[PDB]
Amino acid sequence: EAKAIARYVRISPRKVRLVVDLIRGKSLEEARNILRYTNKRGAYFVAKVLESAAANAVNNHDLEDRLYVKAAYVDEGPALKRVLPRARGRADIIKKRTSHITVILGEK
Amino acid sequence: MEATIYDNTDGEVDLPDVFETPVRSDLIGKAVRAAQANRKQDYGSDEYAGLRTPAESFGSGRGQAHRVPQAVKGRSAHPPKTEKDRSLDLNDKERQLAVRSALAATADVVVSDDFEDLVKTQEVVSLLEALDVHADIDRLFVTSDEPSTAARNLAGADVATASEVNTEDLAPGRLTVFTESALAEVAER
Amino acid sequence: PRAKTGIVRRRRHKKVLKRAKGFWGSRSKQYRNAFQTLLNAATYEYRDRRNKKRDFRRLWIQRINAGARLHGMNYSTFINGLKRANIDLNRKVLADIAAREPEAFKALVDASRNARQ
Amino acid sequence: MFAIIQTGGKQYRVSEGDVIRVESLQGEAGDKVELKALFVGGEQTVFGEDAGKYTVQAEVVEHGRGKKIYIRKYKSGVQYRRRTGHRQNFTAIKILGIQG
RNA sequence: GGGGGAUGACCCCAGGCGGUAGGGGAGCGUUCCCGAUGCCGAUGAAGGCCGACCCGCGAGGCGGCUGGAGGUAAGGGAAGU
RNA sequence: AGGUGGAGCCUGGGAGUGAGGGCGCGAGCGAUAACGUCCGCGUCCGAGCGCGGGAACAACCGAGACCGCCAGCUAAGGCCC
RNA sequence: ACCGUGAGGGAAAGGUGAAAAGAACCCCGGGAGGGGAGUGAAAUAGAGCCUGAAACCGUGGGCUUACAAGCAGUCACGGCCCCGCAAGGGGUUGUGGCGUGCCUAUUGAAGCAUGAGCCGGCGACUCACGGUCGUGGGCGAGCUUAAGCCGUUGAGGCGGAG
């Protein structure tokens, strides 16, 4: 078993969240089509963090396929404190809440 | 009484009623006290800053409330007021008194004039091996009028004079010696 | 004369917190009503502190009835007859009996009924 | 093995299982000691008799130990600006039920 | 308060004890100055993290995990507690 | 006189509120009207005179809360559920 | 820096390590960033990278959840789950049982009166000269200005107008 990740990830932690909460604990290859042919952004991303995942293993963490995702999660952090229209007087900034992305890949 | 004379094998001197006596802790410390006291230093926090800038504490009827203290780094509130009268002039009588009874405590150790002569801080390593221990630990130099030369330097310095060498002096726990002329301060006593 | 109170207060809180089981959604760590909720709970317990011993005075009350009547009568009868007693007077344990040892209970049950009528 | 006398307080329904007992710092000190405990609940081997029939013989139990307050806290509080805190008390010295 | 207290403490009974402004007494940790013939620590200073011994208590001690370098005062003093 | 027993008196330091209501009674006013106010005699509450009762209800009847969960008699008030 | 035309205001922000030895090379990838190797006492010490707590968002697990009321909750009894202080306790609650939050100002307050969204740190009876009682103590005539001298530590000691 091994794992993929990546912080300083611009995106809706939340959104992201649905992402896995699907392909979640499941056959590699398998979901590997969930995110391949699912929808909402993150996917793309999500996918990515599955390849350097499947990789890392076999490569340096070792038995292919028989693998999957014993577990997957995402966390938020660093924000992006963003400034907007001065209450037409006072500032109102939002925050593109950065986004972490860990996710397991262990063998059957 | 047991006014032991140095040089050891040599003579013995008498105990002067003075020292003799009982004790008076209270004053005790007190003496003390009126020590550090007149002997510390002082301090405070900015007069300019802590009441330094302009200030537009803000109108009101707006969503707020209000160059003074209670919002950061600034103000103070009653700090180091350097203008902090530090002294503490005990009192003559008081003082003197202390040292006394004080010393009295010392008794509970006789420096032959003849020493007012020895000429090397390795002649101390001597008149040392004479009578060491832990009380020496304390130690506490002092001649009688004009200090015990070189005797003044080592790993226990301090050379009062038959005049000038009070509680602040050794009073503290401590243990020491005084060149007759020393007990020339007793006269001071 | 610095006072970085620090480390200290923080602690205290921890304090309470503990006082802070895992009660209701929130307070849970509610460094306030946290604290609060407390005060509350407390005194409560208290009054509870003396309470109970009551809740009992009664408990036995029924489990008691359960029998006192069983045979055929109430606790203003029994009682009366009971105190007709002379070298034997108790109530608590009495119950937890009538149920523990039938005979035992059953017994007195008699000597009683009698004492009475 | 199951009797029910009564001490400076009922605290009864026992036989051998030493029962945490109310204070009594005058006879106690007696470590594993022996002392009489009036009855009034004769229940032994399915045979009973007045607690007034009893009040004649009894039993005794060895002065075992000196339980040390089995934890218990008393948050004394109220919205009425009144707080405070004191922990358990009630101990007691333990002692087995010497039956007879 | 009172009957003898050896320093404790022990025994009687009298005798209450709910309490905000507010009055009197007693204690607790907080950062510093003593080192009143005081010094612990790389097999952890300290803070942190967690706990079913000690105290009415505010705190203590003590044991397990963390972390890179300190500082503790058995006693009195001081205060931006 | 005093059964009492524990209040009393003077000197002196430190105070707080300096505007309260609620109930019974005797008066004032008031349409003998008001959870009205205004003086008196006792109580009452005081942000804890916290608990029992009267459903619930400071508050009116009983009660003086040092602490003791698996004791015992009663108060007022109750006992067909 | 920044708002102000101006006079003027006027911030925030420090910390790896013993030293860089600061991560050659190989991996998924457009990269950032993640997987190995290597430095290494430790990198969950790893580049705004010492300690790095709380609030707050996650990932798994125990227990628990669809004829049920209250922040609370706390007293009783029960079942599941763990017994590095074992025949005693941990945690969670199904029921029932008794329960009106918390602060200021108020005759009086649950409050529908106000105070507060949440956490962490700042943040409020102080100092000086007088006077005033009480107390710890030095002499009863008690007591010292300012200064002169002595001063690793720097050691106080003389000063007699008042």
Q: Among residues C36, C37, C110, C21, which one has the least CA distance to residue C73?
A: C110
Q: Which residues of C touch D78 (CB under 8 A)?
A: 39, 43
Report the run of H or E that residue A3 belongs to, with start and end: strand A2-4
Min Cα–Cα distance to chain D from C4, Å: 27
Number of domains in chain D: 1
Q: Are A67 and A12 in contact (CB under 8 A)?
A: no
Q: Are B157 and B141 in contact (CB under 8 A)?
A: yes
Question: In this structure, how many other beta carbons lie within 10 angstroms of the beta carbon of residue D21?
Answer: 24
Q: Among residues A69, A70, A75, A82, which one has the least CA distance to residue A98?
A: A75
What is the token pair recorded at C60?
């036995």
In angstroms, the CA B102 to CA B111 distance is 19
Note the CA–C1' distance, B109 to G67, in angstroms.
98
Q: Are A25 and A68 in contact (CB under 8 A)?
A: yes
Q: Method used for this model? A: X-ray
Question: In this structure, how many other beta carbons lie within 10 angstroms of the beta carbon of residue C101?
Answer: 16
In strand G, the nucleotides that come within 7 Å of a protein beta carbon are: 8-12, 27-37, 53-60, 71-76, 88-93, 96-104, 110-111, 118-124, 126-129, 136-139, 142-146, 150, 152-160
Helices (H), D15-56: 51-54
Q: Are B88 and B41 in contact (CB under 8 A)?
A: no
What is the token pair recorded at B121?
């801080």
DSSP B14: P
Q: Among residues D63, D73, D70, which one has the least CA distance to residue D93?
A: D63
In angstroms, the CA C80 to CA B158 distance is 95
DSSP B15: P
With 0-12 / 13-18 / 19 or more C-beta atoms within 10 angstroms meaning exposed / middle / buried, residue B35 is buried
In angstroms, the CA A103 to CA A24 distance is 9
Got the DSSP string for chain A? -EEE--SS--S-HHHHHHTTTTT-SSBHHHHHHHHHH--STTHHHHHHHHHHHHHHIIIII---SSBB-S-EE--------B----SSSS---B-------EEEE-B-
Tell me the nt nearest to B81, Cα to C1': G127
* Residues 6 or more apart in contact with residue C82 via CB below 8 angstroms: C89, C91, C112, C115
The radius of gyration of chain B from alpha carbons, rounded to an integer in Å, stands at: 26
Q: Cβ of C7 under 8 Å from any chain D Cβ?
A: no
C-alpha to C-alpha distances, B24 to B1, B91, B188, nearest whole angstrom:
20, 16, 19
In angstroms, the CA D66 to CA D21 distance is 9
How many distinct helices (H) and strands (E) make up chain D?
Answer: 1, 2
Q: Are C87 and D50 in contact (CB under 8 A)?
A: yes
Q: Are A13 and A97 in contact (CB under 8 A)?
A: yes
Beta partners for residue D9, in sequence order: D7
Pick the CATH number of A1-108 from 3.90.470.10, 3.90.870.10, 3.40.50.300, 3.20.20.150: 3.90.470.10
In angstroms, the CA B147 to CA C58 distance is 92
Strand A102-105 relative to strand A2-4: parallel, antiparallel, unpaired? antiparallel
Q: Which residues of D touch C38 (CB under 8 A)?
A: 75, 77
Q: Cβ of C56 under 8 Å from any chain D Cβ?
A: no
In angstroms, the CA B154 to CA B146 distance is 18
How many distinct helices (H) and strands (E) make up chain C?
Answer: 6, 0
Q: How far is CA C90 from the centre of its chain?
A: 19
In angstroms, the CA A26 to CA A43 distance is 16
Q: Cβ of C99 under 8 Å from any chain D Cβ?
A: no
Q: Are D50 and C111 in contact (CB under 8 A)?
A: yes
In angstroms, the CA C78 to CA C112 distance is 7
Q: Which residues of D touch C107 (CB under 8 A)?
A: 48
Characterize A23-46 residue by residue with b for buried, 16 or more Cβ atoms within 10 angstroms of its Cβ, and e for exposed: beebbbeebbebbeebeeebbebb
DSSP A21: T
Packing angle, helices A43-56 and A28-37, rounded to 10: 160
A/C Cβ contact: 3+ pairs below 8 Å? no
**What is the greatest pairwise CA distance in chain A?**
61
Q: Which residues of D touch C90 (CB under 8 A)?
A: 6, 10, 40-41, 51
D41: closest chain C residue by CA: C88
How many distinct helices (H) and strands (E) make up chain B?
Answer: 7, 2
Q: Are B153 and B116 in contact (CB under 8 A)?
A: no
Give residue numbers, 46 to 85 of A, with CB < 7 Å from strand G.
48, 51-52, 55-57, 59-61, 71-76
Note the CA–C1' distance, B30 to F12, in angstroms.
30
User: Is the minimum distance from the CB of B48 to strand G below 7 Å?
Assistant: no
Characterize A72-96 residue by residue with b for buried, 16 or more Cβ atoms within 10 angstroms of its Cβ, and e for exposed: bebebeeeeeeeeeeeeeeeeeeee
Q: What share of chain C is helix, strand, coil (3-state, %, to 5)?
A: 60, 0, 40
For an interface test with C, give the residue of D1, D19, D43 to mutate (most C CBs within 10 A).
D43
Question: In this structure, how many other beta carbons lie within 10 angstroms of the beta carbon of residue D34?
Answer: 12
Q: How far apart are the first and last CA of chain D?
A: 9
Residue C106 identity: K
CB contact under 8 A, D46 and C46: no
What is the token pair recorded at A16?
């992201």
Q: Where are the domains of chain A?
A: 1-108
Instruction: State the resolution, in angstroms.
Output: 5.9
E strands present in chain D:
43-44, 47-48
Write the Ramachandran bin of A11: left for phi over 0, alpha for psi from -120 to 50, otherwise beta. left
What is the token pair recorded at A99?
């986004």
Q: Which residues span the domain enclosing D29?
A: 5-98
Residue C27 CA neighbour count, 13 Å, CB half: 17
Residue C71 identity: H
In angstroms, the CA D92 to CA C24 distance is 36
The structure tokens 């009922």 sit at D10
Packing angle, helices C8-19 and C35-50, rounded to 10: 40
Helices (H), B21-153: 27-31, 94-97, 99-107, 124-130, 135-138
In angstroms, the CA B38 to CA B168 distance is 11
* Residues 6 or more apart in contact with residue C87 via CB below 8 angstroms: D40, D50, D51, D52, D53, D54, D55
In angstroms, the CA B20 to CA B95 distance is 18
Note the CA–C1' distance, B135 to E40, in angstroms.
24
Which strands make up the sheet holding A2-4, listed edge to edge? A2-4, A102-105, A72-73
